[PDB]
Design a protein around this nucleic acid. Structure first.
Ligand SMILES: [Zn+2]
Length: 267
DNA sequence: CTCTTTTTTCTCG
DNA sequence: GCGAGAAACAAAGA
């Protein structure tokens, strides 16, 4: 669940639940509500959903007039809109019941989280998380990006995954971005020349923007994406690179599975 | 049976 | 502060 997948979920939710009054909230796994489930149930029951926003890989439900429910899907979180009589599935943990349907949150690994905070605490919340800029030409400044890369000895893939240089990249799109920009994942950032940094900056924006347009990569809301048919290296071990023909290899970098073309991504 | 594979954040040294 | 390794947790494959 990287930025593209989260944005796809945000869009579907925006089109379907905005304006809906929450009738009741139930939980079989209350511990995933970091701010306290009973407190959330008390505060949100009877309130109306005003909108759905996103920051990085974080979903933000705008409920009532001053409430903000921050939701992170982590690795396996999935939302689905179902009928009120829908049977329970093994990994369903929370449900927001409406008059003519319910929003169910499921997460096999139980990594996902819910946090209820106030409207004026959202900006501070993300500053504390140290989340970087959104991947858009408007917010992602190439100049600062370049300066941070020049001052570090960190490897490019692990650094990009930190969410500090830019928000939204996960294992899938970081591998796709580096292949597009012809940069090896273990390259120390202070070794990147200006032309490469420029290509990388543009590629981060292009790949993520393309993934959003195609509804993310599907493998519930959002399982309609088509980006998985556009992947050039992630999970393509042993296949031929679409540019040079060499076999895509898979190695481990900072503990993460890493796919790359040994020819196009030198070093 | 064991070992490995698949976002965020903390413990070590 | 950093890098290495791993925990949180569940399922499936070698
Ligand atoms: Zn290649």
């Amino acid at each position: 669940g990287e930025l593209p997948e989260v944005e796809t979920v945000r869009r579907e939710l925006e089109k379907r639940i905005v304006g809906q009054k929450i009738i009741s909230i139930e939980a079989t796994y209350p511990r995933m509500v970091l701010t306290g489930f009973e407190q959330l149930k008390k505060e949100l029951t009877g309130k109306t959903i005003q909108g759905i926003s996103r920051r990085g890989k974080y979903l933000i439900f705008e409920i009532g007039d001053d409430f903000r429910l921050i939701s992170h899907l982590r690795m396996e979180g999935k939302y689905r809109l179902a009928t009120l009589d829908a049977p329970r599935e093994k990994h369903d943990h929370l449900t927001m019941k409406f008059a003519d349907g319910q929003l169910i949150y499921a997460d096999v690994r139980k990594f996902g989280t819910w946090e209820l905070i106030s409207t004026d605490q959202v900006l501070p919340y993300f500053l504390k998380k140290k989340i970087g800029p959104e991947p858009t030409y408007e917010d992602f400044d190439e100049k600062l990006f370049r300066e941070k890369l020049r001052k570090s000895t960190k490897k490019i893939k692990p650094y990009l995954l930190e969410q500090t240089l830019v928000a939204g990249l996960g294992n899938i799109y970081v591998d796709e971005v580096l292949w597009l920009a012809k940069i090896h994942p273990e390259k120390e950032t202070n070794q990147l020349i200006e032309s490469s940094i420029h290509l990388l900056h543009d590629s981060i924006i292009e790949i993520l923007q393309k993934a959003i347009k195609l509804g993310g990569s599907s493998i519930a809301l959002g399982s309609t994406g088509k980006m998985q048919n556009e992947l050039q290296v992630y999970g393509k071990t042993g296949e031929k690179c679409s540019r040079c023909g060499a076999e895509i290899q898979k190695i481990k970098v900072a503990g993460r599975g890493t796919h790359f073309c040994p020819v196009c991504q030198q070093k």
